[PDB]
Amino acid sequence: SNTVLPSESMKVVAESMGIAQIQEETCQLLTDEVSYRIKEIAQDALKFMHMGKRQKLTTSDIDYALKLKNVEPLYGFHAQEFIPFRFASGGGRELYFYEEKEVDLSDIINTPLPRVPLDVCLKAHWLSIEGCQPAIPENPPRLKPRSIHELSVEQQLYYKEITEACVGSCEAKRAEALQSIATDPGLYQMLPRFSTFISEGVRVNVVQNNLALLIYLMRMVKALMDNPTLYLEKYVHELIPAVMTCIVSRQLCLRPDVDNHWALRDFAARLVAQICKHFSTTTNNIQSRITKTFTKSWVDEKTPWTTRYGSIAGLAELGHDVIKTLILPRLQQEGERIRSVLDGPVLSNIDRIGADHVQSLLLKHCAPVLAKLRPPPDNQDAYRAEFGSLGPLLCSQVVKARAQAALQ
C-alpha cells in the first residue's frame, strides 16, 4: 500500500501557526507532499545503512540522507541565513514521548558521569584450521574388535589434568583449571565423570574431615555452575546432597583452628545452595525439599552444634522473605541454647565456638528484618524481650547500618 501521514494532524499544525480555515483538499495536499519526502529520505537513508554494513543503524543515516538531498541535517531549528549551521548535523534532539518535560539542573550535575572505553584494537583468531572450525570463544558454537571410547584421549588427558589441578596443589593451577571449567564449551559429554568425581569425593572426603579437599570441590561446583554452555539439571541430583553434607556435617578435624575456615566453607556451601535453588526450579521439588530438611535440622533437639551452625547459615542465605517468615517464631529457643552453652565451666569442646557463631549470624539477619520492615525505637532494653542476647550492641550495629544507609 501507500501509507501517508494523517490529515487531521496537518490541520492541528496549521491552526497552531496562524493559518486558520483550511480546506480538506488544501490539507490533503500537505500530507502527500511531506509523506513523499519521508519516503524519499528513508529510501535514501537505506543507502547509507547498506553501505555502512550494519543494518542496525547509528543515529546518523538520516543526517547524511538529508545532506544528500541538499536539506540541512539539524532538527529543531532552521537557519534562513544558513551560515552558523551549514549541512553539519547536531545529532538530533534526545526527546521522548513519556518525557516529563521538567528537569532539575542540580540533579543532572549530581547524576554520575559514564566512563570512556579503550580505543578500537585489532585481534586475530582462526575461523578454520584446514577445513575444521575450532571451538575457541571467538567462534559461535567368535572374535570381534574392542569398542572405542566416545571420550577422546586428548579429552581424557584434559580431564585428568583438570582434576589433578583442581585438588589444589598449586593455586595458579587451580585458578586456571577453575576458569577452564567455567568457560569450556565442550565440557558437556565429560560432565557425568566430573559430577561423579565431585559426589564420590565429598563422601569419602568427609570420612576424614579434609577441609581443603572440600573447599576445592566446592569451588569446582561453583565453577561448574556458571558455565553457560552445559546442561546441569540432569546432574543436580548428585550435586545437591554433596553441598548439603558440607553445610550440615560434623568436622572430624578440630574446629577451634579451621572453624573460621570451616565457617567460610559453610558460607560457600550456602551460597551455591541458594544458587542451586535459584536455578533449576520447578513446582515444589528442589527449594521446598531443602527448606524442609533445613527446618527439621533446626527443630530437632540435641543436634551437633557444627550441624546447627551450618543449617542456620543455610536457612539464613535463602533470600528476603524466607527469614521474614522462618526466622520469626524461634528467637527464644536460640537464646536458651546460648544460655546453656554459657552456663558451666567446660569450654574445651566446640559447643560455645558454635554458639558464638550462630548467635552472631542470627543477630545480623535480625538487623535487616528490623531495618526492612520495622522503625527503630527503644534500642536499650526492649531486646530483653528476646532473651537479651545482642541488646544495646545489636542496637549499635543497627545504628551503623542506618549510618551506611545515610551515606548511600
Partner: peptide, 25 residues
C-alpha cells in the same frame, strides 16, 4: 505435561538426604 521428561528427571525422583551416606555403612 506430566509426560514431560522434567517429571522423569532423576533430581525430581531422588531424595538428596537419603542419598547422603553421612558416614553410615
Amino acid at each position: 505435561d506430566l509426560l514431560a521428561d522434567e517429571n522423569f528427571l532423576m533430581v525430581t525422583q531422588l531424595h538428596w538426604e537419603d542419598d547422603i551416606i553421612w558416614d553410615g555403612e
